[PDB]
DNA sequence: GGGTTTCCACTTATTCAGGCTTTTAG
DNA sequence: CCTAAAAGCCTGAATAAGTGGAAACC
């Protein structure tokens, strides 16, 4: 169907994309390892069309099921990777994932000169993979004995524009309708909530949201051993006047679009004080039921 | 052809999205 | 007293990242 604005695309990849470099034991390879390089996105089935539009925008990649409930877009065909490079050179990433892209590129050149079929290029590919995503396996590090660094330059870049923010929010954003139960007359207080979730490795980027959007807080949550951040807006006037207009102008993608539109219906109802009426409260309840999980 | 590339079927760990309730502001 | 905003959690799962297997190519 329709193509995706390239800056929205980059934001969405900052959210959901990942670069891949496979260094696999291969009895039939002159150096004992074969390699595969690429970029991929894995989403719930409900958003297959997103992956289709990306496929249509770049004219690369392969779409396949990924279990019962996910579907993926994988670009590993070597020449097609040039498209990938050309995109992220012209519309660059800004999360720590940019580091991963910079390693992707570095592997590309190694495989472009065909060095990956010789001892030296394979060794270089191990030294690149050591710093990419989750790094080397135990058996792969024990098979290239040398002292290989895993550390890398932290990325520290600013939000480039509202298109990137629409892509990244389409990925990580949350448009909630919180029904605050109260033993009161009307009972439920309606509270529109905006969240963007992201790991602490990108603190400064989340921080910048406060000033980039002119509203919100940054709060930490955790689960036993892990911790992540939320950018949160709950003051209604920030939402109706600063948050909604931004995504009015820079339209979101995936089913999350429908969640934002519904969120906007309830936000208008709230502007008209109609959430203070049983009539209203009820229409809001119905709207919340068929949005997000209820959809 | 024999290495090597590309594609499919699938799996795992965990950071997201999503949701509650209670407490505080103003 | 009344409603709005914020604090305080807590999970399930959609992500991120990864693998085995083999067809297909060059
Ligand atoms: Ca992400
Ligand atoms: Ca998402």
Short mmCIF file of C-alpha atoms (C1' of nucleotides) and ligand atoms in Angstrom, two decimals:
data_model
loop_
_atom_site.label_atom_id
_atom_site.label_comp_id
_atom_site.label_asym_id
_atom_site.label_seq_id
_atom_site.Cartn_x
_atom_site.Cartn_y
_atom_site.Cartn_z
CA UNK A 1 0.00 0.00 0.00
CA UNK A 2 1.24 3.46 0.97
CA UNK A 3 4.87 4.37 1.56
CA UNK A 4 6.19 5.66 4.86
CA UNK A 5 7.70 9.08 5.43
CA UNK A 6 11.41 8.26 5.83
CA UNK A 7 11.87 10.13 9.14
CA UNK A 8 8.85 8.34 10.60
CA UNK A 9 10.44 5.13 9.34
CA UNK A 10 13.71 5.95 11.10
CA UNK A 11 11.90 6.68 14.36
CA UNK A 12 10.02 3.38 14.16
CA UNK A 13 13.34 1.58 13.55
CA UNK A 14 14.88 3.32 16.56
CA UNK A 15 11.98 1.77 18.43
CA UNK A 16 11.56 -1.74 17.00
CA UNK A 17 14.41 -2.46 14.55
CA UNK A 18 17.54 -4.47 15.08
CA UNK A 19 20.70 -5.14 13.17
CA UNK A 20 21.93 -8.71 12.83
CA UNK A 21 25.33 -10.24 12.19
CA UNK A 22 25.39 -14.05 12.24
CA UNK A 23 28.75 -15.78 12.44
CA UNK A 24 27.89 -19.47 12.15
CA UNK A 25 29.98 -22.62 12.34
CA UNK A 26 30.03 -24.02 8.81
CA UNK A 27 31.85 -27.24 7.92
CA UNK A 28 31.52 -26.29 4.23
CA UNK A 29 33.15 -22.83 4.59
CA UNK A 30 36.80 -22.26 3.67
CA UNK A 31 37.32 -20.45 6.97
CA UNK A 32 34.93 -22.66 8.97
CA UNK A 33 32.31 -19.93 9.44
CA UNK A 34 29.67 -18.41 7.22
CA UNK A 35 28.10 -15.02 7.85
CA UNK A 36 24.76 -13.28 7.39
CA UNK A 37 24.19 -9.55 7.79
CA UNK A 38 21.05 -7.47 7.87
CA UNK A 39 18.28 -5.49 9.52
CA UNK A 40 14.95 -6.76 10.76
CA UNK A 41 11.71 -5.77 12.49
CA UNK A 42 9.45 -8.16 14.38
CA UNK A 43 5.91 -7.11 15.33
CA UNK A 44 2.62 -8.63 16.34
CA UNK A 45 0.51 -9.97 13.45
CA UNK A 46 -1.93 -7.08 13.90
CA UNK A 47 0.66 -4.70 12.35
CA UNK A 48 1.70 -6.84 9.35
CA UNK A 49 0.76 -3.93 7.07
CA UNK A 50 3.41 -1.73 8.71
CA UNK A 51 6.02 -4.26 7.68
CA UNK A 52 4.41 -4.31 4.25
CA UNK A 53 4.60 -0.54 3.84
CA UNK A 54 8.26 -0.54 4.87
CA UNK A 55 8.82 -3.33 2.40
CA UNK A 56 7.09 -1.15 -0.17
CA UNK A 57 9.01 1.98 0.82
CA UNK A 58 12.48 0.43 0.53
CA UNK A 59 11.68 -2.28 -2.06
CA UNK A 60 13.80 -4.73 -0.02
CA UNK A 61 13.32 -7.40 2.60
CA UNK A 62 11.37 -10.60 3.13
CA UNK A 63 8.24 -10.99 5.27
CA UNK A 64 7.62 -14.20 7.20
CA UNK A 65 5.70 -15.52 10.15
CA UNK A 66 7.60 -15.56 13.43
CA UNK A 67 5.62 -17.92 15.68
CA UNK A 68 1.86 -17.92 16.02
CA UNK A 69 1.46 -14.23 16.83
CA UNK A 70 4.31 -12.25 15.27
CA UNK A 71 5.53 -11.49 11.77
CA UNK A 72 8.90 -10.16 10.71
CA UNK A 73 10.64 -8.21 7.97
CA UNK A 74 14.24 -9.31 7.42
CA UNK A 75 16.70 -7.70 5.01
CA UNK A 76 19.83 -9.85 4.57
CA UNK A 77 20.33 -9.99 0.78
CA UNK A 78 23.71 -8.31 0.50
CA UNK A 79 23.03 -5.76 -2.25
CA UNK A 80 19.73 -4.79 -0.60
CA UNK A 81 21.75 -3.76 2.45
CA UNK A 82 22.93 -0.74 0.45
CA UNK A 83 19.37 0.57 0.61
CA UNK A 84 19.49 0.12 4.38
CA UNK A 85 22.77 2.03 4.52
CA UNK A 86 21.52 4.76 2.19
CA UNK A 87 18.43 5.22 4.35
CA UNK A 88 20.15 5.51 7.71
CA UNK A 89 22.87 7.71 6.23
CA UNK A 90 20.23 10.15 5.04
CA UNK A 91 17.80 9.65 7.98
CA UNK A 92 20.03 8.70 10.89
CA UNK A 93 19.15 6.86 14.09
CA UNK A 94 19.44 8.64 17.45
CA UNK A 95 19.07 5.94 20.14
CA UNK A 96 21.94 3.74 21.31
CA UNK A 97 20.88 1.59 18.36
CA UNK A 98 22.86 3.98 16.17
CA UNK A 99 25.94 2.34 17.63
CA UNK A 100 24.59 -0.98 16.37
CA UNK A 101 24.02 0.54 12.93
CA UNK A 102 27.59 1.81 12.90
CA UNK A 103 28.74 -1.75 13.45
CA UNK A 104 26.37 -3.03 10.76
CA UNK A 105 28.01 -0.67 8.26
CA UNK A 106 31.47 -1.73 9.39
CA UNK A 107 30.61 -5.37 8.70
CA UNK A 108 29.09 -4.42 5.35
CA UNK A 109 32.40 -3.08 4.05
CA UNK A 110 34.19 -6.22 5.27
CA UNK A 111 31.75 -8.37 3.33
CA UNK A 112 31.77 -6.01 0.34
CA UNK A 113 35.52 -6.51 -0.15
CA UNK A 114 34.84 -10.27 0.29
CA UNK A 115 37.27 -10.39 3.23
CA UNK A 116 34.74 -12.45 5.23
CA UNK A 117 35.81 -15.54 3.24
CA UNK A 118 39.42 -15.23 4.51
CA UNK A 119 40.83 -15.66 8.01
CA UNK A 120 41.43 -11.94 8.45
CA UNK A 121 37.95 -10.74 7.49
CA UNK A 122 36.30 -13.36 9.68
CA UNK A 123 38.43 -12.26 12.62
CA UNK A 124 37.47 -8.65 11.94
CA UNK A 125 33.80 -9.68 11.86
CA UNK A 126 34.17 -11.28 15.30
CA UNK A 127 35.70 -8.08 16.66
CA UNK A 128 32.72 -6.16 15.25
CA UNK A 129 30.08 -8.58 16.54
CA UNK A 130 31.60 -8.47 20.04
CA UNK A 131 30.11 -4.98 20.48
CA UNK A 132 26.85 -5.51 18.55
CA UNK A 133 23.71 -6.08 20.63
CA UNK A 134 24.33 -9.01 22.94
CA UNK A 135 27.90 -9.69 21.77
CA UNK A 136 29.65 -13.01 21.23
CA UNK A 137 28.58 -16.39 22.54
CA UNK A 138 30.91 -18.28 24.85
CA UNK A 139 31.87 -20.77 22.14
CA UNK A 140 32.47 -18.03 19.58
CA UNK A 141 34.73 -16.00 21.88
CA UNK A 142 36.64 -19.13 22.88
CA UNK A 143 37.23 -19.83 19.17
CA UNK A 144 38.87 -16.44 18.49
CA UNK A 145 41.18 -16.29 21.50
CA UNK A 146 42.28 -12.68 21.23
CA UNK A 147 41.49 -9.87 23.66
CA UNK A 148 38.34 -8.40 22.09
CA UNK A 149 36.78 -5.25 23.48
CA UNK A 150 33.01 -5.25 24.03
CA UNK A 151 32.74 -1.54 24.90
CA UNK A 152 31.62 1.17 22.50
CA UNK A 153 30.90 4.87 22.18
CA UNK A 154 27.64 5.87 23.84
CA UNK A 155 25.35 7.72 21.45
CA UNK A 156 24.07 11.13 22.53
CA UNK A 157 21.90 12.75 19.87
CA UNK A 158 18.89 15.03 19.95
CA UNK A 159 15.41 14.43 18.54
CA UNK A 160 15.76 15.71 14.95
CA UNK A 161 12.12 16.63 14.28
CA UNK A 162 8.52 15.62 14.96
CA UNK A 163 8.47 12.95 12.23
CA UNK A 164 11.08 10.88 14.04
CA UNK A 165 9.08 11.34 17.22
CA UNK A 166 5.97 10.03 15.44
CA UNK A 167 7.84 6.91 14.31
CA UNK A 168 9.41 6.35 17.71
CA UNK A 169 6.07 6.91 19.47
CA UNK A 170 4.22 4.64 17.07
CA UNK A 171 6.71 2.13 18.44
CA UNK A 172 6.99 2.90 22.16
CA UNK A 173 4.00 5.17 22.81
CA UNK A 174 1.01 4.62 25.08
CA UNK A 175 -2.35 6.43 24.83
CA UNK A 176 -4.18 5.40 27.98
CA UNK A 177 -7.61 6.16 29.40
CA UNK A 178 -7.31 5.62 33.15
CA UNK A 179 -10.65 5.09 34.92
CA UNK A 180 -9.79 6.24 38.45
CA UNK A 181 -12.44 4.49 40.54
CA UNK A 182 -13.75 6.66 43.38
CA UNK A 183 -16.46 5.95 45.94
CA UNK A 184 -17.94 9.23 44.68
CA UNK A 185 -21.28 10.20 43.12
CA UNK A 186 -20.43 9.91 39.42
CA UNK A 187 -17.65 7.57 40.55
CA UNK A 188 -14.95 7.28 37.92
CA UNK A 189 -12.52 10.12 37.21
CA UNK A 190 -11.34 9.93 33.59
CA UNK A 191 -7.59 10.54 33.21
CA UNK A 192 -5.93 10.61 29.80
CA UNK A 193 -2.36 9.30 30.09
CA UNK A 194 0.55 9.57 27.66
CA UNK A 195 3.64 7.36 28.06
CA UNK A 196 6.79 6.62 26.13
CA UNK A 197 8.74 3.68 27.57
CA UNK A 198 12.45 3.22 27.08
CA UNK A 199 15.46 1.72 28.82
CA UNK A 200 17.78 3.82 30.97
CA UNK A 201 20.60 3.47 28.42
CA UNK A 202 18.84 6.37 26.64
CA UNK A 203 18.17 8.57 29.70
CA UNK A 204 19.33 11.82 28.05
CA UNK A 205 17.05 11.21 25.12
CA UNK A 206 14.03 10.56 27.32
CA UNK A 207 15.03 13.58 29.39
CA UNK A 208 15.03 15.74 26.27
CA UNK A 209 11.39 14.84 25.69
CA UNK A 210 10.42 17.07 28.64
CA UNK A 211 11.86 20.11 26.90
CA UNK A 212 11.21 18.86 23.37
CA UNK A 213 7.46 18.66 24.03
CA UNK A 214 7.17 21.20 26.84
CA UNK A 215 5.51 18.95 29.42
CA UNK A 216 5.75 15.65 31.28
CA UNK A 217 7.81 13.83 33.88
CA UNK A 218 10.39 11.06 33.71
CA UNK A 219 9.82 8.24 36.20
CA UNK A 220 11.57 4.94 36.83
CA UNK A 221 9.91 1.54 37.16
CA UNK A 222 11.44 -1.89 37.70
CA UNK A 223 10.77 -5.63 37.74
CA UNK A 224 12.96 -7.43 40.29
CA UNK A 225 16.33 -7.02 38.54
CA UNK A 226 15.46 -4.70 35.63
CA UNK A 227 14.51 -1.04 35.42
CA UNK A 228 13.19 1.22 32.65
CA UNK A 229 11.95 4.79 32.29
CA UNK A 230 8.66 6.35 31.31
CA UNK A 231 8.01 9.77 29.90
CA UNK A 232 4.54 10.54 31.28
CA UNK A 233 2.02 13.30 30.63
CA UNK A 234 -1.11 13.33 32.82
CA UNK A 235 -2.07 17.04 33.10
CA UNK A 236 -4.94 17.29 30.64
CA UNK A 237 -4.07 20.69 29.16
CA UNK A 238 -0.58 19.45 28.21
CA UNK A 239 -2.27 16.51 26.47
CA UNK A 240 -5.04 18.30 24.59
CA UNK A 241 -2.85 21.29 23.70
CA UNK A 242 0.74 19.94 23.40
CA UNK A 243 0.57 16.18 22.78
CA UNK A 244 -2.46 15.62 20.55
CA UNK A 245 -1.60 18.40 18.05
CA UNK A 246 1.88 16.94 17.53
CA UNK A 247 0.42 13.62 16.35
CA UNK A 248 -2.36 15.36 14.48
CA UNK A 249 0.37 16.91 12.34
CA UNK A 250 2.86 13.99 12.24
CA UNK A 251 0.51 11.05 11.79
CA UNK A 252 1.24 7.75 13.56
CA UNK A 253 1.32 4.28 11.98
CA UNK A 254 0.11 0.80 12.86
CA UNK A 255 -3.00 -0.01 14.83
CA UNK A 256 -1.69 2.42 17.43
CA UNK A 257 -3.08 5.08 15.09
CA UNK A 258 -6.60 3.94 15.94
CA UNK A 259 -5.69 4.10 19.62
CA UNK A 260 -4.61 7.72 19.22
CA UNK A 261 -7.79 8.59 17.31
CA UNK A 262 -9.99 7.02 20.00
CA UNK A 263 -7.85 8.77 22.60
CA UNK A 264 -8.69 11.99 20.74
CA UNK A 265 -12.44 11.24 20.85
CA UNK A 266 -12.28 10.86 24.63
CA UNK A 267 -10.06 13.96 24.87
CA UNK A 268 -12.65 16.07 23.03
CA UNK A 269 -15.42 14.63 25.22
CA UNK A 270 -13.28 15.68 28.19
CA UNK A 271 -12.71 19.21 26.87
CA UNK A 272 -16.51 19.63 26.65
CA UNK A 273 -16.75 18.63 30.36
CA UNK A 274 -18.92 15.73 29.13
CA UNK A 275 -16.86 13.22 31.14
CA UNK A 276 -18.59 14.70 34.20
CA UNK A 277 -21.96 13.36 32.94
CA UNK A 278 -23.21 9.77 33.13
CA UNK A 279 -23.93 10.02 29.39
CA UNK A 280 -20.31 11.01 28.81
CA UNK A 281 -18.72 8.65 31.34
CA UNK A 282 -20.56 5.82 29.58
CA UNK A 283 -19.44 6.76 26.06
CA UNK A 284 -15.87 6.99 27.43
CA UNK A 285 -16.18 3.54 29.03
CA UNK A 286 -17.33 2.06 25.71
CA UNK A 287 -14.44 3.78 23.91
CA UNK A 288 -11.83 2.46 26.35
CA UNK A 289 -13.26 -1.07 26.08
CA UNK A 290 -12.51 -1.35 22.34
CA UNK A 291 -9.11 0.35 22.42
CA UNK A 292 -5.62 -0.96 23.22
CA UNK A 293 -6.07 -4.49 24.68
CA UNK A 294 -9.81 -4.39 24.06
CA UNK A 295 -9.28 -3.96 20.31
"C1'" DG B 1 29.56 -27.94 -8.86
"C1'" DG B 2 31.21 -26.42 -3.54
"C1'" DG B 3 31.24 -22.68 -1.18
"C1'" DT B 4 28.31 -19.11 -0.14
"C1'" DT B 5 24.05 -16.54 -0.12
"C1'" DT B 6 19.24 -16.21 1.09
"C1'" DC B 7 15.37 -17.61 2.77
"C1'" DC B 8 11.88 -19.96 6.25
"C1'" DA B 9 10.45 -21.98 10.54
"C1'" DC B 10 10.98 -21.12 15.09
"C1'" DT B 11 12.68 -19.97 19.95
"C1'" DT B 12 14.17 -17.08 24.02
"C1'" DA B 13 14.82 -13.29 27.03
"C1'" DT B 14 13.17 -8.86 28.43
"C1'" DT B 15 11.82 -4.12 27.56
"C1'" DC B 16 8.46 -2.48 26.57
"C1'" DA B 17 3.12 -1.00 26.44
"C1'" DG B 18 -0.63 -1.51 29.17
"C1'" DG B 19 -3.16 -1.34 33.20
"C1'" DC B 20 -4.56 -0.84 38.34
"C1'" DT B 21 -5.26 1.68 42.84
"C1'" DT B 22 -4.16 4.97 46.14
"C1'" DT B 23 -2.54 9.52 47.54
"C1'" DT B 24 -1.84 14.28 46.76
"C1'" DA B 25 -2.84 19.08 44.61
"C1'" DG B 26 -5.02 22.97 43.81
"C1'" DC C 1 -16.07 19.19 49.10
"C1'" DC C 2 -14.64 18.46 44.29
"C1'" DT C 3 -12.19 17.28 40.62
"C1'" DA C 4 -7.46 17.09 38.50
"C1'" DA C 5 -2.63 15.31 38.74
"C1'" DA C 6 0.63 12.62 40.40
"C1'" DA C 7 2.71 8.71 43.03
"C1'" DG C 8 3.13 3.79 43.30
"C1'" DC C 9 3.18 -0.30 41.70
"C1'" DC C 10 2.73 -4.91 38.76
"C1'" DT C 11 2.45 -7.95 34.51
"C1'" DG C 12 1.92 -10.09 30.17
"C1'" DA C 13 3.69 -10.18 26.07
"C1'" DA C 14 5.17 -7.69 21.81
"C1'" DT C 15 9.12 -6.80 20.99
"C1'" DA C 16 14.45 -7.08 20.14
"C1'" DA C 17 17.60 -10.43 19.35
"C1'" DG C 18 18.56 -14.70 18.20
"C1'" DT C 19 19.03 -19.92 16.12
"C1'" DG C 20 18.60 -24.45 13.18
"C1'" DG C 21 17.99 -26.07 8.71
"C1'" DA C 22 18.32 -26.28 4.00
"C1'" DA C 23 17.14 -24.58 -0.69
"C1'" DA C 24 19.22 -21.77 -4.16
"C1'" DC C 25 22.44 -19.64 -6.35
"C1'" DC C 26 26.86 -18.31 -8.89
CA1 LIG D 1 12.67 -0.35 21.63
CA1 LIG D 2 5.50 -1.25 19.76
#
